[PDB]
Amino acid sequence: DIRPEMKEDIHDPTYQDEEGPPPKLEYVWRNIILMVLLHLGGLYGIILVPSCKLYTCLFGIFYYMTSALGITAGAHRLWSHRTYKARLPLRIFLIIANTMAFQNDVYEWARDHRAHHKFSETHADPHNSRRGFFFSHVGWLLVRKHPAVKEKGGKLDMSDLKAEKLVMFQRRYYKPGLLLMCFILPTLVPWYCWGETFVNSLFVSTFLRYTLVLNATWLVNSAAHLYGYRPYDKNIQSRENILVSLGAVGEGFHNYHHTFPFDYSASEYRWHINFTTFFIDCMAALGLAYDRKKVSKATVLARIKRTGDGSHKSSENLYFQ
Ligand SMILES: CCCCCCCC/C=C\CCCCCCCC(=O)SCCNC(=O)CCNC(=O)[C@H](O)C(C)(C)COP(=O)(O)OP(=O)(O)OC[C@H]1O[C@@H](n2cnc3c(N)ncnc32)[C@H](O)[C@@H]1OP(=O)(O)O
Ligand SMILES: [Fe+3]
Ligand SMILES: [Fe+3]
Numbered sequence: 001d002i003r004p005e006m007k008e009d010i011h012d013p014t015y016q017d018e019e020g021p022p023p024k025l026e027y028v029w030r031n032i033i034l035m036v037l038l039h040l041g042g043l044y045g046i047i048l049v050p051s052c053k054l055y056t057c058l059f060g061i062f063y064y065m066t067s068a069l070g071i072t073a074g075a076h077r078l079w080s081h082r083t084y085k086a087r088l089p090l091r092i093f094l095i096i097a098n099t100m101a102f103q104n105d106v107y108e109w110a111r112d113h114r115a116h117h118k119f120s121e122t123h124a125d126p127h128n129s130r131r132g133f134f135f136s137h138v139g140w141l142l143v144r145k146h147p148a149v150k151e152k153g154g155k156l157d158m159s160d161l162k163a164e165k166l167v168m169f170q171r172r173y174y175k176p177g178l179l180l181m182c183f184i185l186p187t188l189v190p191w192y193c194w195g196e197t198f199v200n201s202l203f204v205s206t207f208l209r210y211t212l213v214l215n216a217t218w219l220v221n222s223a224a225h226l227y228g229y230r231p232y233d234k235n236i237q238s239r240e241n242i243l244v245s246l247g248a249v250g251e252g253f254h255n256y257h258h259t260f261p262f263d264y265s266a267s268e269y270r271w272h273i274n275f276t277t278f279f280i281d282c283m284a285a286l287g288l289a290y291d292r293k294k295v296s297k298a299t300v301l302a303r304i305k306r307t308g309d310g311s312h313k314s315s316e317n318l319y320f321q
Contacts, residue, residue, distance in 0.1 A: 002293045003262040006082050008156040009117040010261065011236070015152070017123050026144040035138060042211030045203030052204050055194040060209045063100065063186050067213045068249045070097025071109075072276040076251065076266070079161055080110035083264035083293050084280065088166075090288040095170050100181040101213055105174040106167045107158065115153035117261050121225075121237055124148035129225035129237050137215075137222035182210055216247040224254035231312035232259045232268075232304055242273060250274030259303065264292045268300060270321040294321075 049057070074094035077083050086094070095106070103109055112126045119125050123146040127136040161167050170177065183206055190196035190205045219241075228239025238258035245252025245267075253267035253274070265277045283289040304312045 002295065003082065006157065006160060008114050008158075009081055011120060011258070012118050015119050015122055015124065017148075019123070019148070022123060022146070028142055028144065031142045035142065038207060038214075039211055041203055041207035043208075045200075045206075045208035045211075048200055048203050049208070052200050053190075053194055053196050056190045056196045056200060056205055059186070059190055060205050063205070064209055064213055064216075065249070066097045067101035067182075068216070069276065069279055070094055070099070070101045071103060071213075071217060072249055072251050072266075073280050074098045075103070075106050075109040076113070077264055077276070077280070079106050079164075079167060080113040081261050082160065083262055084289055085291040086283070087288045090283050091166055095166055096181065099170065099174070099177040100186070101217075102178045102182040102210065103214075103217065105171045107161050107171050110161055111153055111156065111158060112149075114156050114158075115149060116221075117258065118156065119148070119152050120258065122148065122152075124152035126153070127221040129221065133222050133226060136225060137218045140221075182206070219244050220248055220251050220254060224252060228255065229311040230255050230309045231315070232256050232300070233307045234309035235307055245273040250276035250278075260295045260300070262293055263295045265294055268315075269319045270294070272319055 075098055078086055078091075078094065098106060098109075104112075116125050116127060121128060121130050126145060126149050127140045128146075129136045131139075186209065187198070187201040187206050190201040191198055196205065224239050224241050224244050225237045226239065228241035228244075230236070230239060232255050236255065236258050238254040240255045241252050243252070244254070250273065251257070251266055256268055257263070257266040264280060265274060267274050267277070270277050270281065280289055280292065284292055
C-alpha cells in the first residue's frame with residue numbers, strides 16, 4: 001500500500017455486467033465526419049512529408065514528443081493515478097503539453113480513465129475492450145457512453161482534481177487552449193520560423209502530427225487489451241506490447257500498469273522503452289518532482305508467482321530497475 005492517498009483506480013472485481021442486454025450503440029455524427037476528415041488530412045499530410053523542409057519534420061517530432069508527455073506523465077500518471085507529486089513549474093509545462101495533445105481536458109480525461117481502471121472490461125469502462133478492437137480504439141469516441149460509465153464513474157471521487165487550481169484553470173479555458181495549441185500554433189510556427197508552406201504546416205505539422213499522437217494513444221486501449229503477454233496477471237486483458245511502449249513513449253506495459261496502477265513507471269523497469277519515466281526522473285533530478293511511487297520487487301515477484309502467466313521468466317533480472 002504505497003499510495004493510500006487515493007484509491008479510485010484500483011480494480012473492483014465485484015463489478016460485472018448484469019443489467020440485461022446492452023442497448024444499441026448511438027452514433028454521434030458530428031464526431032464521425034471530423035475523425036474521418038482528420039485521418040484524411042493526416043493521410044494527405046503523409047504523401048506531403050517528402051516535400052517538407054527538415055525543420056518541419058523535427059518540429060513535428062518534438063511536438064509529438066511534448067504532447068506525448070502531456071498525456072503520459074501529465075494526464076495519466078500525475079492526475080489520473082496520483083503516482084507522484086509535481087511542483088508548479090513542471091505542472092505548468094504539463095498542463096500546456098496536455099492542451100497540445102487535445103484529448104479533452106484533464107478532469108474529463110482522468111474521470112474516463114479512473115473508470116477504465118476500476119471498472120475495466122465492463123460497460124462502465126469507457127473503452128470496453130470486450131466490445132471489440134474498433135470500439136476501444138476510436139469507436140467509443142463516436143457513439144454515446146453506456147449509462148454504466150456515467151453512473152458508476154460518477155461515483156468516483158474527483159475531489160483532488162476538483163481542488164487543484166491549475167487543472168480547473170485548464171477546464172475553464174480549454175476550448176481556446178486546444179485551438180491555439182493543437183492546430184493554430186504548430187501551423188503558424190513552421191510557416192513563419194523556416195517558411196514551410198501553409199499547406200505543409202497544416203497537413204504535416206498539424207493533421208498528421210495530431211493524428212499520430214491520437215492513434216499512438218488509442219493503441220493503449222485497442223492493441224494493449226488484446227495482443228501481448230501477461231507476465232503479471234493472466235486474469236485481466238491488459239498486455240505487455242512492446243511496440244505500444246515505443247509509440248506511446250512508455251505506456252505500453254499495460255499489463256503491469258493495470259496491475260500496479262500506482263507505480264509511477266507504468267512498468268517494472270524504469271527506463272526500459274519508457275521515455276516517460278526517464279523524463280519524470282529528470283524533473284525529479286531538477287527538484288520539480290518527488291514522491292515517485294514505485295512497487296517493491298518482492299510484491300511484484302510474489303504477484304508474478306500468483307496470477308502471472310509465466311512469460312516473465314524470459315525477462316527475470318535484465319535491468320536493475
Ligand atoms: C503518444 C501518447 C501516448 C499516450 C498513452 C496513454 C495511455 C493511457 C491508458 C489507457 C488509454 C487512455 C487514453 C484515452 C484518452 C483518449 C481521449 C481522446 O483521444 S479525445 C480526442 C478529442 N476529443 C474528442 O474526440 C471528444 C469526443 N467525445 C464525445 O464527443 C463524447 O464524450 C462521447 C461521444 C464520446 C460520449 O457522448 P455522451 O453524451 O454519451 O457522454 P459525455 O457527453 O462525454 O458526458 C456527459 C455526461 O455524462 C457524465 N459522464 C461522462 N463521463 C463520465 C465519467 N467518466 N464518469 C462520470 N460521469 C461521466 C457527466 O455528467 C457528463 O457531464 P459533464 O462532463 O460533467 O459536463
Ligand atoms: Fe487499459
Ligand atoms: Fe492508467
